[PDB]
Design an enzyme around this catalytic site. Sequence first.
Site, PDB file in Angstrom:
ATOM      1  N   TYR A 144      -3.135   2.559  -9.249  1.00 46.57           N
ATOM      2  CA  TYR A 144      -2.375   3.048  -8.078  1.00 46.57           C
ATOM      3  C   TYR A 144      -2.875   1.802  -7.003  1.00 46.57           C
ATOM      4  O   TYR A 144      -4.418   1.551  -7.258  1.00 46.57           O
ATOM      5  CB  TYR A 144      -2.749   4.161  -7.283  1.00 46.57           C
ATOM      6  N   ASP A 238      -7.540  -5.540  -8.791  1.00 41.56           N
ATOM      7  CA  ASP A 238      -7.456  -4.592  -7.764  1.00 41.56           C
ATOM      8  C   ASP A 238      -8.927  -4.085  -7.466  1.00 41.56           C
ATOM      9  O   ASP A 238      -9.143  -3.117  -8.251  1.00 41.56           O
ATOM     10  CB  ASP A 238      -6.460  -3.740  -7.640  1.00 41.56           C
ATOM     11  N   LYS A 266     -11.858  -0.735   1.295  1.00 42.36           N
ATOM     12  CA  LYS A 266     -12.940   0.236   1.561  1.00 42.36           C
ATOM     13  C   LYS A 266     -14.232  -0.027   1.791  1.00 42.36           C
ATOM     14  O   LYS A 266     -14.441  -0.353   3.088  1.00 42.36           O
ATOM     15  CB  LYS A 266     -12.945   0.992  -0.052  1.00 42.36           C
TER      16      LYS A 266
HETATM   17  C1  LIG Z   1      -7.542   0.424  -6.146  1.00 43.03           C
HETATM   18  C2  LIG Z   1      -6.746   1.076  -4.916  1.00 43.03           C
HETATM   19  N1  LIG Z   1      -5.900  -0.100  -4.353  1.00 43.03           N
HETATM   20  C3  LIG Z   1      -5.178   0.213  -3.216  1.00 43.03           C
HETATM   21  C4  LIG Z   1      -5.286   1.281  -2.595  1.00 43.03           C
HETATM   22  C5  LIG Z   1      -4.525   1.845  -1.125  1.00 43.03           C
HETATM   23  O1  LIG Z   1      -5.449   1.673  -0.015  1.00 43.03           O
HETATM   24  P1  LIG Z   1      -4.558   1.924   1.214  1.00 43.03           P
HETATM   25  O2  LIG Z   1      -4.252   3.482   1.020  1.00 43.03           O
HETATM   26  O3  LIG Z   1      -5.707   1.865   2.426  1.00 43.03           O
HETATM   27  O4  LIG Z   1      -3.397   1.125   1.343  1.00 43.03           O
HETATM   28  C6  LIG Z   1      -6.035   2.583  -3.132  1.00 43.03           C
HETATM   29  C7  LIG Z   1      -6.386   3.739  -2.616  1.00 43.03           C
HETATM   30  N2  LIG Z   1      -6.068   4.981  -3.476  1.00 43.03           N
HETATM   31  C8  LIG Z   1      -6.872   2.248  -4.360  1.00 43.03           C
HETATM   32  O5  LIG Z   1      -7.793   2.999  -4.962  1.00 43.03           O
END
Ligand SMILES: Cc1ncc(COP(=O)(O)O)c(CN)c1O
Lengths: 424, 424
Positions: A144, A238, A266
């Site tokens: 995701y 990612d 994060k």
């Molecule tokens: C690897 C990764 N990339 C992107 C996201 C999305 O981050 P955000 O909800 O702040 O857009 C997440 C959160 N599930 C994630 O774990």
Amino acid sequence: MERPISEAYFQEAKRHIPGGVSSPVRAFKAVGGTPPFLVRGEGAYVWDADGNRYLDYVMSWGPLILGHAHPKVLARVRETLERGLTFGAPSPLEVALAKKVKRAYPFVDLVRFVNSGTEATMSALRLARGYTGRPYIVKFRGNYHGHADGLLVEAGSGALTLGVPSSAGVPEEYAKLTLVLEYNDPEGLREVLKRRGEEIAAIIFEPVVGNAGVLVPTEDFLKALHEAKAYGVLLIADEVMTGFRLAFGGATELLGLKPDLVTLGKILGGGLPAAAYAGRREIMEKVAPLGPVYQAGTLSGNPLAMAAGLATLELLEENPGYYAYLEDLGARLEAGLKEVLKEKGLPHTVNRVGSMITVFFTEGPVVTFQDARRTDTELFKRFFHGLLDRGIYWPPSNFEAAFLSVAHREEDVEKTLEALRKAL
Amino acid sequence: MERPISEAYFQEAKRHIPGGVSSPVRAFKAVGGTPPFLVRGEGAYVWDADGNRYLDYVMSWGPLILGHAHPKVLARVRETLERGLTFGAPSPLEVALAKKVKRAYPFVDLVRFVNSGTEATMSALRLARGYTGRPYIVKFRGNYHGHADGLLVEAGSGALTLGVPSSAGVPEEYAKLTLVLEYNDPEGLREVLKRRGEEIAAIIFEPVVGNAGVLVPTEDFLKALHEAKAYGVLLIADEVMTGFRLAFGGATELLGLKPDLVTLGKILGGGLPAAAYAGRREIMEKVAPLGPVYQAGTLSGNPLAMAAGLATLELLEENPGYYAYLEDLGARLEAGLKEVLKEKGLPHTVNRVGSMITVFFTEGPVVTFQDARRTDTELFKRFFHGLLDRGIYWPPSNFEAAFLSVAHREEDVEKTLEALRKAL
Ligand SMILES: Cc1ncc(COP(=O)(O)O)c(CN)c1O
Ligand SMILES: Cc1ncc(COP(=O)(O)O)c(CN)c1O
Ligand code: NA
Ligand code: NA
Ligand code: NA
Ligand code: NA
């Protein structure tokens, strides 16, 4: 455990917010029950509206590697807020954080800050397409990267690798340029490259998966991923979740990856909304105002988030030993979980990398998303609620990685194991 | 005015960030020169890294209607941060802010918070498509709702209304479901509805445009927009900029709009990143976890942003007179600008609605985006730098609305007029 006030808040929340929450998983649909409304945190612990204290393994889903309300981080935010919450202009703080990112990721030349992981990945994929001039992008099952429409897809049942909309409101037109492959399936990936590697702009992937629970990449899968580079495909790691966590330089440092672009978030914001995409200058210079790939963010690079992130990254860079501490504590939790579950005669597979861990209730090994889906979610419910009723807050879904923080201690792990021995 | 330190920061920033900025416009490409690095703000004033003080008309692009560092807003953020920066779980603060939004927007039943305007509009369009089951969406020239790929389009030169990619990295497939119409062109809109209104899921629009400079909707254009509702089309009012600004209930209240969905932001977060999409329950209940339209945000509903926004909205709701004050001060600035420019014999058209104002350097009237593009950007440069060199910070682009705040005073307007008399 009683939580009448949270119950009242949840009922009220549902009258004004869809499902009573800002993000689906927070609604406890996968495990049932009312989610505790959290109002305070300190170190590895959190308190709900009813005063109940919990050992926190969610840790706001990744940003809190240093634990809740770290004194140094809060101090930096306190100082910064007095000058103003936002300016909409360049700030010395953004430059400072960008330099820190570049210390963690040597291959990077330029860093562009955005407000969320969703924006970071959406921008990075657009950038890859703009740089290569190619239309297709590859994503893996169970991974995701945010809710950009083109990513809200699942594998189709036929021979085409084109994704099919996995959410309502997503037109087939937006899904047909995303190819969906299985994670940890090098043969499948090599085959797609042979079929049309030259029309794929990029492959995005979680170096160590967390959003399907923890999945660890095999040596051969990692090899196949880098082989795509020979086809002109850009490799996008990612690291929104793994960045600054598995090491200062994230999974890229830990696994020795050579990505073309990396997305971060994060921990990058130290607890406040912040994300970014970065890479070498020849690719990043395509981004506006330098190039034709457009991306903007009015409130991007927020002063408070830059400050919280800067204070956080400085501490991590100043304390490499924190990663060894997390590894040792994680090793102890993993061994302990196996012991307890084996004693209970329950089917299980515990995947862990550093401070990221997931307990799958199915016989191992769990390598692909298909393997992950075999987990017994009914047993997970028992596991989850047994822990919650005993003051231990675990992610409310089997398809999530739990997180350890530098604030967690050996005694916290032991209390967790004991809670399980009594709960199951 | 000397700004050697900002110059040094800009040169350094370019080595680590694309163009040295997090958002294109901040790079001063449209006006030339080095952008001042802002480090402090108070009321209607801001200071750069060289200690230069400026009367601020940018105000971080809209969130600061109460001015920089309002004491009450900062106090609420200070209190909240001590409890922790993020939790990733339901919070009483989110419920409180959602209720405030519902007081400002009576038609709304449910509110979903996200981290940015881009995410809010992207989600709202997906929601409209999911609710109606239709593929097409309509946007207007000059309007900006964020950088979701499907929105990064411009009008094509032929008879088709389908948009064509206006940024690199955006495939034709992502652009072909967006129809591009001219703002304030009711005849064109009525025609498109007659052609295929039944396959259009939604029409999104800025009630009072700001991202092409200020454009005010005509009575007939507003009428045509609501007529689309009879075709089953959902009307999406993008109030990220106008919300809580033109009135407590935004342009919806001011113009008596009847939208099906509204997107909010900027003021909503009181200076910190926060946005939202909202509407009646029958539509909003399609959003996860209630429905099949997926949207998530790990760090959405951040405690500090909810607190800053709540403190801000409480003040606005408690002081309806603030809107009358802004209207009177805005009237004075508009009249003053016309007088000075007329005396200078310069072609100009000043569009304003409440605290949003833009000076176009072309003979009036400026109603459509086509009209706006006639503005003399060379003269704007002279206008911009004449103001900047005299301590007045105006948006660094002719295609932007300038903002007044409750902190601005009559004497500030007069100093602005005087600066112009001497500059031009
Ligand atoms: C690897 C990764 N990339 C992107 C996201 C999305 O981050 P955000 O909800 O702040 O857009 C997440 C959160 N599930 C994630 O774990
Ligand atoms: C009306 C409108 N909608 C959406 C946005 C985008 O907001 P953000 O950059 O925080 O995604 C803007 C900012 N230009 C806007 O003015
Ligand atoms: Na398929
Ligand atoms: Na998941
Ligand atoms: Na056309
Ligand atoms: Na603009």
